[PDB]
Structures are given as structure tokens and as C-alpha cells.
């Protein structure tokens, strides 16, 4: 009997928690600055700030059911992106970054794979929330090429507008070779400095000439290139580099004195860059035999030189994080007494980092570095017609955190009817980062919170996430309810406990593990085919609970609910359209303030519930010409950022930021935009 079982991997792209969004998919939704946003649209995903403090809350970045965007793990062809760690994690989860779904040019993505929960663990490290996979296009060894550009027109400027052009080529190198090469140019403006203004919360004295910024913008070079050989039947060598250079053009948290102000001097320029080199050498390897081989290194280098913030008690400094990756796996079909395929793996990864932050304060330190090794087991097993088991085992070592054990299971029942019962438990695992391990790593914050440091007795988070899902498919129907429930533990956030003063009576924190928190929901899918010609796709995602359980707060602020879907029509073989709507239930912030105390009056301010709705046709003019045009927020409904979530100062005293409760972020108006894609 030659058939053979698919590899667990493959299997679990099956899950009830996954989702899968084509080029075709990405070609037909134009992304302005980031392809997150069409990343949110899969159940079980927002676009949410990294603290739940409201701190950065323009910066969005994906959010896996409720877990917070530091808990989405993205790969990219299936490598892990570490560039974040070049950025210090402030005191309260906040990042300065833009997240890492920018790195590849949106023109550039064969694929995206949303893994939530149970198939997401299996990833290692980081995979907490889930795993946003990245998959690009691929040459065939023949001439083929293209020439794209994109820009979009807000109706009110103050919304900073976006333009961004690229190229592809790939063709044949020789006998057995053949190469890839991309490059990228984009562009965002910053939002108006004053766009928050008449919206901004209450505030005074020495806070009144002050206002909640805007979104900053990019700036965004890339090249990329690859070299594939292909040595023998299903056997193949690949070498890739490629350089990126990220960019902001300014405007904080604060970009608002209508003075000419610290603030008002950087608004517009560059504060703050990320190049990052990434190198990697691939040998996948095939048999008649059904066994498989996917060996990989990479090399990631990243430079994070920005222009400090503050102060403690225009020149960059930088810090140089290094990355290296080691994997090596062997998929083997075998037949004991039912048919299925096991797969054995290794990984080596070892981060290096070289800061510039010693603060005299008055903790000098040059180097950090960790190792984390792996094996792997995973078995996809047929042990029915109908019935599929997936037991899987990694185990980790890391270098200053120790030993993790994580197990997983899936598993697939038909039930007749073409329907299907789906369930998965698996544990997640998220080591600490340089930062949050090291004493000399420390954070001064005015108050006494007063000094915060590394620790290096933190335990790694870990998390039991689990689904069951029901699901009912055929002939372009689909309906599926899923429920999903994360089990969090130890999760790395501030202390809640002095450690004891300093040589001034001043207070010292550590980093430190919560204990548990947990997040809970449901998940929903529809798909009717409603002509030959006309399709209707919806998801829903509802939230039953997020909380961390000591502090009995909220563990990321999104809707209670999100409802996404999509009306498109194939009026021409050459011309669709469709129209996009978006749900959004209540956005409830934090309960309770620093201290513990229950959030009061404007710091509970709730966003009601509001919809997005947009519409836009794609005209494939030759089979070498396409244009898009569509408009984005058809209604113009807005949202403006207040400031943070809570207040700062006192309401009655003579100096004070009133909170802004969930309205800490802008939602952009009526934009319209036109893509024109070139090929061959």
C-alpha cells in the first residue's frame, strides 16, 4: 500500500484554531502600511496595543485570542523573526517596535498561516497565543517577474497617507540553478501632530499644553535575495540574504505641545531604526521511499539605534542583537499496525546582545546571551477511516531558565455527513528575554514602583491551551463553532513586591511570574456559497473571559466580541468586487489602577460597540495587468486617542492627565487607495 499519511505538521493545519489567507486573498484587500490588517480579520485575532496601560496605544499590533500581541510568535517560511528583542520591554509591557508582520513586502506573500492555541504550541518558544506563519512567494526556474505600487488618500489629512512600490525577478542561473530577487520602497506619513486635539482628555497645569499623539509613521527598504539548487530528484539547497530598513517618522506619545516644544522639535523625523539582516541555508530532501528531511540554518542580525526618551536618576544608541538558529528534522511513513508518520526533531538557537546601558543613577553591563536546545517527537496517526491522533512531545533546554516539557494531542473524528469533531490540548512555551533575566537590566520610574530589575530565577510562561470544535463542510459550505480555553502560567510582568530599598530607602522590583490567569472564548465560521458567482464569508469571535487571576484584571483590552465579513461578487471572469464589514463589540479597559485601587470615572470610559465598512473592485485588465481601487471605513466612523487608560496626577490638584478609560487609540476615517500590479 503506498498511501501515506500526511506529517503532523501538515495535520495540523487542520485544526479548528487555523486559517489560512491566499495571495489571491491579499491581492484583492490592498494593505496600506501593514498586512496585519487583514491578519485581524481571521477569528480569534485583534489589533490591539502591547499594555493594557493605553502606553503606545497607536502602536497595534496582532493579538491572538486575548493573549496580547507579545504572545504572537511570527515565522517567516517557517523561520522565527527575533528582531523585537533588540527593543527593550518597558515596565509595563510596552514596546517600541512596529511589530514584526513588516518585514515582508504584502506583494511578496504567497501565503499567511494564523495557527491559535493548541496547533500554534508545537512552534516552541514564544508560541503562546498563537503563530502568525509567513510565506512567500516562490520562484519556478523560469523567467517570471513583477512591478507593483500602491498608495491610498485619506479625506482628512490629518491622517497621514501611505505610498509603496516593489519588484520581483526570478528565473534560471545556469543547469541546476536558478534565483529570487525582491526589493521594496514604502512609505507612511506620520499622523498631524494635532489630530488628537479637541479629544484629548482633561488635563492641567504643567500637562495642558499637552496632547495624545497620533499614529507615527514608517519608512520601510528592503532586498532580498536567493539562490536555490537543485542537486537531485526532491533534493534542493537554498541560500537567501536579505536586508530590510525600518524607519519612523516621529510623533511619541505625546506629540502635542501647540509650543515649540522637546515634543514639537522631533515631530516628523527619524528617531528611532531597525536594519536587519537575516541569512539562511536550506537542504530539504525527498525519497520514493516517503521519508522526508527539512534542515535549515539561519542567521539574524538586528541593530536597534534609536534616540533615548527622557532621562534617569540628536544621538543615537544602539543595540545589536544576534540570532542564530539551528533545526533539523526527519519525517518517516511508517507502517506498525495502522498507517502514520513520525517526525524527529532538533533545534539549536543561540541570542546574543550587546547594549549600551549602564545608567549612572546615582547597571553597567556589555553582553547577555542564552542558548535554548530541543528535541521533538510527533506522530500523525490514521487510526481509522475517520479517525486521526496527532501526540506530539518537545522538549526544551534553556541555558539560564532550565529544562520545559511540553506535550501535545489533537485530534480528528469524522462524523458523517461531512461533518467533523475536532479537539486539541497542547502546552505552550515562552522563555524570558535577555532583559527580564538580567539584574544589571534595571528601570527607574518616578514613584515610591521605583526600581525595577532582571531577575534570573524567573520561571519560563507557560500555558495549556486547549479547543473542541465542530465543523460542517462542503462544496463552498462551511459552518463551525469552536471553543477555546488558555491556561496561563507564570507570566513574566512587573512585581507586585518590593525586594527590599536601596542605599536611599528607595524600593526595588524584580520581574517577575503570575502565577495563572486564563482566557476563554468562542469561535465562529460561515461560508455560503450564495450563487456561482457571489460568496458570503463571515467569522465571529466572542470572549467569555481574560483575566489575570492575581490581579483579577483584564489581560488585554479588545472587543467583547468581533464579527468580520466579506460579500464578494465575480461579475466578469475578469472582474470581482466585494464588500467588507467589520463588527466591533465593547472595548472595557483595566478595573483597577497601579495601585491596586478600582479604576474611577474617566478611567472607565468604555468604546460602545461600532462598524467599519469598506468596498473595493480588482480588474485583471491583461493577464499581466491588474488594478484595485476601494475605499476603506465607507462611513467614516473615527475614533481619536484621549491619552492613557488611567489618570495621572490628581483630578483635584493643580496638575493632571485625566484618563481616557479604552479610547486610546485613533481609528482612521474615509480612505481611498488604488493598487496597480505588474506581471509576467
Same mark, same amino acid.
Given at each position: ?14 485544526? #479548528? ?27 480569534? $485575532? ?15 499590533? %496582532? ?23 533588540? $527593543? ?29 492555541? #493548541? ?22 526556474? =523560469? ?11 485619506? @479625506?482628512?489629512? @490629518? ?56 499614529? @507615527?509613521?514608517? %519608512? ?103 540570532? &542564530? ?21 532538533? @533545534? ?41 491522533? *496527532? ?28 461533518? *467533523? ?10 522563555? #524570558? ?33 486547549? =479547543? ?12 463551525? &463553532? ?54 458570503? *464569508? ?40 466585494? *464588500? ?19 479604576? &474611577?470615572? #474617566?478611567?472607565?470610559?468604555? %468604546?460602545?460597540?461600532?462598524?467599519? &465598512? ?42 493632571? %492627565? ?23
Amino acid at each position: 500500500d503506498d498511501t501515506i499519511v500526511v506529517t503532523a505538521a501538515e495535520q495540523n493545519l487542520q485544526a #479548528p484554531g487555523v486559517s489560512t489567507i491566499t495571495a489571491d486573498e491579499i491581492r484583492k484587500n490592498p494593505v496600506a502600511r501593514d498586512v496585519s490588517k487583514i491578519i485581524r480579520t481571521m477569528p480569534g $485575532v485583534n489589533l490591539t496595543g502591547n499594555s493594557t496601560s493605553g502606553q503606545r496605544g497607536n502602536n497595534r499590533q %496582532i493579538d491572538i485570542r486575548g493573549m496580547g500581541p507579545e504572545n504572537t510568535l511570527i515565522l517567516i517560511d517557517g523561520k522565527p523573526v527575533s528582531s523585537r528583542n533588540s $527593543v527593550r520591554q518597558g515596565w509595563r509591557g510596552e514596546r517600541d517596535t512596529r511589530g514584526d508582520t513588516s518585514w515582508v513586502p504584502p506583494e511578496m506573500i504567497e501565503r499567511i498561516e494564523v495557527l491559535r492555541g #493548541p496547533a500554534a504550541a508545537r512552534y516552541g518558544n514564544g508560541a503562546a497565543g498563537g503563530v502568525v506563519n509567513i510565506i512567500t512567494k516562490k520562484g519556478s526556474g =523560469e523567467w517570471h517577474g513583477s512591478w507593483d505600487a500602491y498608495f491610498n488618500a485619506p @479625506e482628512h489629512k @490629518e491622517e497621514g497617507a501611505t505610498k509603496r512600490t516593489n519588484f520581483s525577478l526570478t528565473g534560471p542561473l545556469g543547469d541546476e540553478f536558478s534565483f529570487r530577487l525582491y526589493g521594496n520602497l514604502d512609505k507612511t506619513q506620520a499622523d498631524a501632530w494635532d489630530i488628537n486635539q479637541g479629544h484629548q482628555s482633561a488635563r492641567a497645569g504643567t500637562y495642558a499644553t499637552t496632547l495624545p499623539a497620533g499614529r @507615527e509613521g514608517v %519608512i520601510n527598504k528592503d532586498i532580498n535575495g536567493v539562490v536555490r539548487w537543485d542537486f537531485a530528484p526532491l533534493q534542493s539547497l537554498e541560500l537567501e540574504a536579505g536586508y530590510s530598513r525600518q524607519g519612523n517618522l516621529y510623533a511619541g506619545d505625546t506629540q502635542n505641545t501647540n509650543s515649540d516644544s522637546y515634543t514639537r522639535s522631533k515631530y516628523g523625523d527619524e528617531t528611532n531604526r531597525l536594519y536587519r539582516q537575516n541569512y539562511a541555508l536550506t537542504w530539504n530532501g525527498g525519497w520514493d521511499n516517503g521519508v522526508t528531511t527539512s534542515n535549515w540554518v539561519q542567521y539574524e542580525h538586528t541593530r536597534n539605534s534609536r534616540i533615548p526618551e527622557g532621562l534617569a536618576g540628536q544621538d543615537f544608541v544602539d543595540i545589536d542583537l544576534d540570532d &542564530v538558529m539551528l533545526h533539523s528534522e526527519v519525517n518517516l511513513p511508517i507502517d506498525f499496525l495502522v498507517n502514520q508518520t513520525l517526525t524527529l526533531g532538533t @533545534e539549536w538557537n543561540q541570542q546574543r546582545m550587546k547594549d549600551l546601558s549602564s545608567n549612572t543613577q546615582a547597571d553597567r553591563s556589555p553582553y547577555s546571551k542564552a542558548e535554548i536546545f530541543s528535541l521533538f517527537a510527533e506522530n500523525n496517526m490514521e487510526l481509522t477511516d475517520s479517525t486521526i491522533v *496527532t501526540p506530539g512531545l518537545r522538549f526544551d533546554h534553556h541555558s539560564i531558565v532550565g529544562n520545559n516539557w511540553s506535550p501535545a494531542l489533537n485530534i480528528s473524528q469524522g462524523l458523517g455527513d461531512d461533518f *467533523t469533531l475536532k479537539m486539541g490540548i497542547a502546552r505552550a512555551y515562552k522563555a #524570558p528575554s535577555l532583559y527580564q533575566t538580567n539584574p544589571n537590566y534595571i528601570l527607574y520610574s518616578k514613584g515610591q514602583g521605583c526600581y525595577l530589575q532582571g531577575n534570573d530565577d524567573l520561571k519560563a510562561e507557560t500555558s495549556i491551551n486547549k =479547543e473542541i470544535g465542530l465543523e460542517f463542510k462542503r462544496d463552498g459550505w462551511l459552518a463551525g &463553532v469552536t471553543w477555546f480555553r488558555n491556561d496561563y502560567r507564570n507570566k513574566i510582568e512587573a512585581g507586585y513586591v518590593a525586594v527590599g530599598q536601596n542605599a536611599v530607602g528607595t524600593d526595588l522590583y524584580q520581574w517577575d511570574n503570575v502565577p495563572k490567569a486564563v482566557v476563554e472564548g468562542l469561535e465562529g465560521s460561515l461560508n455560503v456559497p450564495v450563487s456561482e458567482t457571489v460568496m458570503w *464569508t463571515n467569522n465571529i469571535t466572542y470572549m467569555l473571559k481574560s483575566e489575570n487571576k492575581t490581579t483579577g484584571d483584564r489581560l488585554s483590552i479588545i472587543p467583547e466580541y468581533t464579527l468580520n465579513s466579506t460579500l464578494s461578487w465575480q461579475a466578469r471572469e475578469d472582474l470581482s468586487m466585494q *464588500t467588507t464589514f467589520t463588527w466591533y463589540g465593547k472595548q472595557q479597559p483595566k478595573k483597577y489602577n497601579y495601585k491596586g485601587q478600582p479604576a &474611577v470615572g #474617566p478611567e472607565t470610559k468604555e %468604546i460602545s460597540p461600532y462598524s467599519i &465598512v469598506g468596498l473595493s473592485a480588482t480588474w485583471d485588465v491583461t493577464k499581466n495587468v491588474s488594478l484595485t481601487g476601494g475605499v476603506d471605513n465607507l462611513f467614516d466612523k473615527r475614533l481619536w486617542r484621549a491619552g492613557n487608560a488611567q489618570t495621572t496626577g490628581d483630578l483635584a490638584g493643580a496638575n493632571y %492627565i485625566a484618563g481616557a478609560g479604552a479610547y486610546t487609540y485613533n481609528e482612521p476615517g474615509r480612505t481611498w487607495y488604488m493598487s496597480v500590479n505588474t506581471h509576467f
